């Protein structure tokens, strides 16, 4: 298919994320190649090279077409594409589970693989609810979280999305009614933790778990909070016997400057979800980890087996590329790499602070954010970014980047310059 043919088929038949099909002002851009940190897109009938500043929704940490990851896939493809995990096991699953248990916060020694982040959150919730059924306390059936959060798009995951500002707000009437603490602040305030504890204490007998994104809340607004809050949550949850679940689907694998964001606080949750960067952006995969005690208790009493089992559970292809991606991360000085990236983002975004439509500029590891005073118009932002050789995808009032770890300092500067210019056009601005 030519790019024009692709556009025609796409307009007629393809539903895109978070959209009203046939009603979007900004049409999809055709992508025809991806190599390293760069995408080849078609614009005005011609190929242009642009930086993947979004890492393809925060997944492509080593860039595209990395030879180690490519070859891990093709090596597994030759041996065994896939077998059912119901009754069988295999080397890629074992290798990946071993790696994940070793690098995640202490105590997480059991791994349930699934095919997507939203499913891994549903699995985490199922684990927490079934845990309490195994304990003979089935009244512990609600979840608690703080506002500003996002945990995926399946119906239980939607129930812990921010109720007012979250994308799933219109569904509140049909979702499980969960417990919400106020928005966690950026700076540490002991009063916030005290109030969280008081609220949790009131509901403890009906709460299976607290579920939060640690340190960085991504899709709900790119908000950062002090890691000390996580220390407090761990303490509160321990004292009131509520399980602690960390959703690290966005924060995992070095993105915030630590291997997992939990590590900024030295905290271990009872259950943890990972995904996105897990596969280096090649294939869909996610995992839910839990402690041995959680795993055992889930089938205690009359609770029985954990009744979940995705058809493509522990897919050899996805596991094999994930193993390579994780090993590639661990085999380099990733901490210094992310520190350099953060410094580049900070330096490059500094001039945005003085722009009239900019409310805040903030950086956490390989995450750089310009918060604006109005929603960002994609019809204006997209051409401006492409004109500068950068693929950016703003949402709400945020112009942000989560670039591949392989970006050179010059590439980071190109990205930040494009971001600054997009921000200038938000408030330029007719």
Ligand X SMILES: *Cc1c(COP(=O)(O)O)cnc(C)c1O
Ligand Y SMILES: CNCc1ccc(Cn2cccn2)cc1
Consult the annotation and say whether 118 binds a ligand. yes
Consult the annotation and say whether 117 binds a ligand. yes
Residue 297 binding target from a copy of itself, ligand Y, ligand X, none, CB below 5 to 8 Å by type: none
Consult the annotation and say whether 311 binds a ligand. yes
The whole-angstrom separation of Cα 376 and Cα 393 is 10
Task: Give me the least distance between CB of 394 and ligand Y, in Å please.
Answer: 8
Task: Give me the least distance between CB of 118 and a copy of itself, in Å please.
Answer: 7
Consult the annotation and say whether 344 binds a ligand. no
Site for ligand Y, rule CB under 6 A: 18, 57, 86, 219, 309, 311, 393, 395
DSSP codes joined into one string, 382-394: HHHHHHTTEE---
The whole-angstrom separation of Cα 142 and Cα 209 is 7
Consult the annotation and say whether 57 binds a ligand. yes
Residue 193 binding target from ligand X, a copy of itself, ligand Y, none, CB below 5 to 8 Å by type: none
Are β-strands 46-52 and 223-224 bridged in parallel, bridged antiparallel, or unpaired?
unpaired
For ligand Y, the closer CB: 95 or 308: 308
Consult the annotation and say whether 405 binds a ligand. no
Site for ligand X, rule CB under 6 A: 116-118, 121, 150-153, 213, 218-219, 247, 249-250, 275-276, 310-311
Catalogue the active-site residues. Answer: 18, 150, 247, 276
**Closest C-alpha among 226, 266, 218 to residue 105:** 266
Q: Where are the beta strands (DSSP E) in 139-285?
A: 142-146, 179-181, 207-212, 216-217, 223-224, 243-247, 271-274
Task: Give me the least distance between CB of 146 and a copy of itself, in Å please.
Answer: 21
Angle ∠(253,156,84) on CA atoms, nearest 5 = 65
Consult the annotation and say whether 247 binds a ligand. yes
The whole-angstrom separation of Cα 21 and Cα 41 is 22
Residue 170 binding target from a copy of itself, ligand Y, ligand X, none, CB below 5 to 8 Å by type: a copy of itself
Residue 222 binding target from ligand X, a copy of itself, ligand Y, none, CB below 5 to 8 Å by type: none
Task: Give me the least distance between CB of 94 and ligand Y, in Å please.
Answer: 20
256-to-156, 165, 205 alpha-carbon distances in Å: 26, 24, 34
For ligand Y, the closer CB: 305 or 354: 305
For ligand Y, the closer CB: 141 or 393: 393
Report the half-sphere exposure of 63 (CA within 13 A, side-chain side).
18
For ligand X, the closer CB: 211 or 323: 211
Task: Give me the least distance between CB of 341 and a copy of itself, in Å please.
Answer: 20
For a copy of itself, the closer CB: 298 or 357: 298
Residue 151 binding target from a copy of itself, ligand X, ligand Y, none, CB below 5 to 8 Å by type: ligand X
- For the chain, the residues before each gap (C–N > 2.5 Å) are none
Task: Give me the least distance between CB of 249 and ligand X, in Å please.
Answer: 4
Residue 191 binding target from a copy of itself, ligand Y, ligand X, none, CB below 5 to 8 Å by type: none
Consult the annotation and say whether 403 binds a ligand. no
Which helix (H) or strand (E) segment holds residue 123: the answer is: helix 117-134
The whole-angstrom separation of Cα 275 and Cα 281 is 10
304-to-96, 134, 183, 288, 338 alpha-carbon distances in Å: 27, 8, 37, 19, 44
Query: Which two three-digit tokens encode residue 82?
Result: 């896939």
What are the φ and ψ backbone dihedral angles of 288, each rounded to 5 degrees? Answer: -120, 120
The whole-angstrom separation of Cα 220 and Cα 218 is 5
For ligand X, the closer CB: 89 or 311: 311
- Pick out the residues of the known binding site for S-adenosyl-L-methionine: 57, 150, 309, 393
User: Residues annotated in the binding site, as ranges?
Assistant: 57, 117-118, 150, 247, 276, 309-311, 393
Question: Which residues fall in the annotated binding site for pyridoxal 5'-phosphate?
Answer: 117-118, 247, 310-311
**Residue numbers belonging to the annotated binding site for substrate:** 276
């Amino acid at each position: 298919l030519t790019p024009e043919q692709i556009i025609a088929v796409d307009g007629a038949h393809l539903w895109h994320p978070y959209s009203s099909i046939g009603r979007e002002a900004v049409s999809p851009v055709v992508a025809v190649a991806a190599h390293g940190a760069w995408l080849t897109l078609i614009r005005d009938g011609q190929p242009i090279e642009v930086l993947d500043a979004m890492s393809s929704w925060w997944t492509a940490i080593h860039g595209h077409g990395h030879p180690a990851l490519d070859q891990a896939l093709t090596t597994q493809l030759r041996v065994m594409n896939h077998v059912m995990f119901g009754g069988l096991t295999h080397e890629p699953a074992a290798r990946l589970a071993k790696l994940l248990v070793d690098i995640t916060p202490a105590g997480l020694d059991t791994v349930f693989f699934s095919d997507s982040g939203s499913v891994s959150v549903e699995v985490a919730a199922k684990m927490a609810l079934q845990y309490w059924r195994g304990r003979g306390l089935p009244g512990k059936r609600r979840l608690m979280t703080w506002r500003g959060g996002y945990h995926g798009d399946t119906f239980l995951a939607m129930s812990i999305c921010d109720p007012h500002g979250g994308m799933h707000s219109l569904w509140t009437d049909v979702l499980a009614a969960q417990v919400f603490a106020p928005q966690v602040p950026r700076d540490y305030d002991p009063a916030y933790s005290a109030a969280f504890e008081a609220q949790l204490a009131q509901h403890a007998g009906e709460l299976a778990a607290v579920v939060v994104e640690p340190v960085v809340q991504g899709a709900g607004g790119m908000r950062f909070h002090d890691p000390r809050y996580l220390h407090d949550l761990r303490d509160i949850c321990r004292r009131y016997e509520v399980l602690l679940i960390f959703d690290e689907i966005a924060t995992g694998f070095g993105r915030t400057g630590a291997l997992f964001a939990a590590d900024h606080a030295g905290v271990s949750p009872d259950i943890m979800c990972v995904g996105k960067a897990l596969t280096g952006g090649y294939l869909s995969l996610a995992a839910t980890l839990c402690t041995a005690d959680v795993a055992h208790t889930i089938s205690a009493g009359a609770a029985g087996a954990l009744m979940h089992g995705p058809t493509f559970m522990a897919n050899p292809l996805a596991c094999a590329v994930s193993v390579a991606s994780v090993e590639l991360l661990l085999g380099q000085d990733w901490r210094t790499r992310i520190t350099e990236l953060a410094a580049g983002l900070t330096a490059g975004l500094d001039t945005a602070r003085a722009l009239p439509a900019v409310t805040d500029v903030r950086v956490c590891g390989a995450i750089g954010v310009i918060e604006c005073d109005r929603p960002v118009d994609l019809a204006v932002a997209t051409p401006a970014a492409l004109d500068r050789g950068v693929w950016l995808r703003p949402f709400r009032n945020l112009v942000y980047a989560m670039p591949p770890y392989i970006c050179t300092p010059a590439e980071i500067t190109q990205i930040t310059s494009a971001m600054v210019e997009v921000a200038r056009l938000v408030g330029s601005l007719p």
